[PDB]
Design a binder for these strands. Structure first.
Ligand SMILES: O=c1ccn([C@@H]2O[C@H](COP(=O)(O)OP(=O)(O)O)[C@@H](O)[C@H]2O)c(=O)[nH]1
Ligand SMILES: [Cl-]
Ligand SMILES: [Mn+2]
Ligand SMILES: [Mn+2]
Ligand SMILES: [Mn+2]
Length: 535
RNA sequence: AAAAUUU
RNA sequence: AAUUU
C-alpha cells in the first residue's frame, strides 16, 4: 500500500560544498599509493540513493509479531520516565549542531541565550496545541569516505539524512531523551547491544556460544532499514513509549511528534525547495537509534519464533543483529533461516544479503566487525574484535584543506589495538609521522600519543602487546586490503616498525615506553613487558 | 541529523 | 575527537 517516498524532482543539494582530495597527500602518501580509490560520497549521488530506497511496502503481521509486541509492553510499563527541562535538553545539543532556520545556532542553545530559549518555548507550545500539522524537515546527503569496490559497482551512493529544525530537535529531547536512557534496556535486557563495550560484546558472544550443546550462529541486516519502517511501525513505536509512566505532558508531546514528524512529512532541500514527502523513518530524529533497535528487535524475535529458532540468544544494535541458537542440524538450520528471512520480509524488514547459518564464531560479521582469535604471551587463546581494514585505511588517506586524518589513525589505533593491522600498519605510520613532525607531546582529540600504552592496557589488557599467530582469515584479509589500496605489504611494515621502535627508544621517557610496549612484536628478542602503573 | 560506545 | 548503526 504505502510508498516510502515521493519526489517533486527537485535536486538534493549540498549543505555547504564538499571538498576534493588534492594532487599531493603528504600525511598519507607513504601509507598507501592508490588515492584514486579513496572517495567521499557526494550529494550528486543522492538522486541514485533515492531511486534505490523509494518502494512500496506491504507489512503483514501474525500471532508471533502480536505476541512479542505484547510482552514488550509488559516490559515497558516497568519504566517511569520524566520530562527534561527545556534547559537540560538544550544542554544535550552537540556543539556543532546545524543552526536553526530562525536565526540562532548551537552556541546560543547551549549557552541558553534568551532568544533561543523563547523560540524553543514557542515550538513546544505549538506541539502541545497542534497534534497534526506536518512538521517540515530538511533532507541532505551524508558525506562519508570509502574505498571504491568495482565488485559492488564502484561508488556507493550517499545515504539520506532527514531532520527537523534545531528548535524541534531540542523539544524531541525534552519529551523523549529520558525514555531513550531507560526503555531499550528495559524491553530487551541483555540483548540490548549498545549497552556493552567491545570487550563485553566479545565475552557475551563467547558465553552465548559456550552455553549451547551444539551452537549455530548467524547475523541479519535490513536493506535500507530506515525506508522499510512503516507508518504503522512508528505508531507502534509510539504505543511502546506510552506504555511507560509519563507526565501527561510528555504523552501529548510524544503523540504530537509521532503524528507530525515521525510518521512522515515534507522534505526540503538545502536551498528551500520542496523535495519530496516521506512515509518512513527519518534518520535524524532523536528516536532513530532507539526506534530502529526496538522495532528491529520486535520483528526479529517474532521471526525467530516463526522460524523455530531454538534457544535464541540475541544481540541487537539498530538494524544489526546476531542470533546464537541450538543447531537443529544443518539441513533444518538452513530451512529455518529461509523461514526467518521470509517472516522478516513479511514484516517489512527485508535483508541485504540473505543470511546463512554458521558454526564458527569468526565467520559471523555484524556492525561491520567480527570476533577473531590469536595466541597470547603465555600461549592461551585470546578472542578480540576486528574488521576489514579497507575502510579505515581509506579514511586514513582522506586529506583535504578542511580535514586531517590523524585523528582517525588514533581512533582506530585505540579501538582496534589488538588487531594485526593496527599494530603493524596504523601504529607504525602514526608514530613515524609524529616523530618526524616532532609532535608526540601534541594532544589529538584530547588524547596523548604517549599515554597509549596505558590507554590500550586499560582497555584491552596487557595481552594486546604480546599477541601472535593471527588467524588465516585475518592475515588473508589484511594482506588483501593493503594490496587493494596500494600500501606496502606487511614485511615492509615489520622494517618500518623496527626503525620507529629504535628511534622511539633512543628518545627515552614515555616515548621509549611506547617504543618498547607498542612495538615488541617487531623485535627478534622480545621483552618482559609488565603492568603499567597508570592503568 | 540523531544515538550509543570509546576517550 | 574516534568508531559504529
Ligand atoms: O549514519 C547513519 C547510518 C545508519 N543510520 C540508521 O541505521 C539504519 C541501518 O543502517 P545500515 O548501516 O544497515 O544502512 P541501511 O540499512 O539504511 O542501508 C539506517 O537505515 C539509518 O536509519 C543512521 O541514522 N545514520
Ligand atoms: Cl596467554
Ligand atoms: Mn541495514
Ligand atoms: Mn498517541
Ligand atoms: Mn546495518
Amino acid at each position: 500500500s504505502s510508498m516510502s517516498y515521493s519526489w517533486t524532482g527537485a535536486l538534493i543539494t549540498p549543505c555547504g560544498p564538499e571538498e576534493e582530495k588534492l594532487p599531493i597527500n603528504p600525511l598519507s602518501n607513504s601509507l598507501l599509493r592508490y588515492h584514486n580509490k579513496v572517495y567521499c560520497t557526494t550529494s550528486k549521488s543522492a538522486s541514485q540513493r533515492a531511486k534505490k530506497v523509494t518502494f512500496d511496502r506491504t507489512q503483514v503481521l501474525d500471532a508471533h509479531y502480536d505476541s512479542v509486541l505484547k510482552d514488550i509492553k509488559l516490559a515497558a510499563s516497568k519504566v517511569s520516565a520524566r520530562l527534561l527541562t527545556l534547559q537540560q535538553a538544550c544542554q544535550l545539543t552537540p556543539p556543532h549542531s546545524a543552526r536553526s532556520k530562525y536565526g540562532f545556532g548551537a552556541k546560543e542553545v547551549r549557552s541558553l541565550s534568551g532568544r533561543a530559549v523563547n523560540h524553543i518555548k514557542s515550538v513546544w507550545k505549538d506541539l502541545l496545541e497542534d497534534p497534526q500539522t506536518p512538521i517540515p524537515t530538511t533532507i541532505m546527503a551524508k558525506n562519508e569516505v570509502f574505498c571504491v569496490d568495482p565488485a559492488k559497482g564502484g561508488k556507493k551512493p550517499a545515504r539520506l539524512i532527514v531532520y527537523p529544525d534545531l528548535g524541534v530537535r531540542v523539544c524531541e529531547k525534552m519529551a523523549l531523551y529520558d525514555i531513550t536512557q531507560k526503555l531499550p534496556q528495559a524491553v530487551m535486557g541483555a540483548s540490548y547491544g549498545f549497552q556493552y563495550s567491545p570487550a563485553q560484546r566479545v565475552e557475551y558472544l563467547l558465553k552465548a556460544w559456550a552455553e549451547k550443546k551444539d551452537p549455530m550462529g548467524f547475523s541479519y541486516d535490513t536493506r535500507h532499514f530506515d525506508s522499510t519502517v512503516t507508518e504503522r511501525d512508528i505508531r507502534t513505536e509510539e504505543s511502546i513509549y506510552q506504555a511507560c509512566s509519563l507526565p501527561e505532558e510528555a504523552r501529548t508531546a510524544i503523540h504530537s511528534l509521532t503524528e507530525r514528524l515521525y510518521v512522515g512529512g515534507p522534505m526540503f532541500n538545502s536551498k528551500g525547495q520542496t523535495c519530496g514527502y516521506r512515509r518512513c523513518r527519518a534518520s535524524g530524529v532523536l528516536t532513530t537509534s532507539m526506534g530502529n533497535t526496538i522495532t528491529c528487535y520486535v520483528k526479529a524475535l517474532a521471526a525467530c519464533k516463526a522460524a523455530g529458532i531454538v534457544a535464541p540468544t540475541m544481540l541487537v544494535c539498530g538494524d544489526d543483529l546476531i542470533v546464537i541458537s541450538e543447531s537443529q542440524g544443518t539441513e533444518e538450520d538452513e530451512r529455518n533461516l529461509r523461514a526467518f528471512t521470509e517472516a522478516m520480509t513479511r514484516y517489512s524488514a527485508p535483508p541485504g544479503d540473505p543470511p546463512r547459518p554458521e558454526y564458527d564464531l569468526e565467520l559471523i560479521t555484524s556492525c561491520s566487525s567480527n570476533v577473531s582469535v590469536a595466541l597470547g604471551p603465555r600461549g592461551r587463546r585470546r578472542y578480540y574484535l576486528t574488521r576489514d581494514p579497507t575502510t579505515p585505511l581509506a579514511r586514513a588517506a582522506w586529506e583535504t584543506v578542511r580535514h586531517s586524518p590523524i585523528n582517525s589513525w588514533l581512533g582506530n589505533i585505540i579501538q582496534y589495538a589488538p588487531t594485526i593491522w593496527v599494530r603493524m600498519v596504523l601504529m607504525t605510520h602514526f608514530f613515524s609521522i609524529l616523530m618526524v613532525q616532532d609532535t608526540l607531546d601534541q594532544n589529538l582529540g584530547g588524547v596523548n600519543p604517549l599515554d597509549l600504552p596505558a590507554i590500550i592496557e586499560r582497555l584491552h589488557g596487557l595481552d594486546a602487546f604480546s599477541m601472535h599467530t593471527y588467524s588465516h582469515h585475518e592475515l588473508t584479509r589484511v594482506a588483501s586490503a593493503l594490496r587493494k589500496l596500494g600500501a606496502p605489504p606487511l614485511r615492509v611494515w615489520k622494517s618500518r616498525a623496527r626503525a620507529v621502535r629504535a628511534s622511539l627508544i633512543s628518545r627515552g621517557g614515555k616515548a621509549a615506553v611506547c617504543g618498547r610496549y607498542l612495538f615488541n612484536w617487531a623485535v627478534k628478542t622480545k621483552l618482559k613487558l609488565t603492568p603499567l602503573p597508570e592503568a
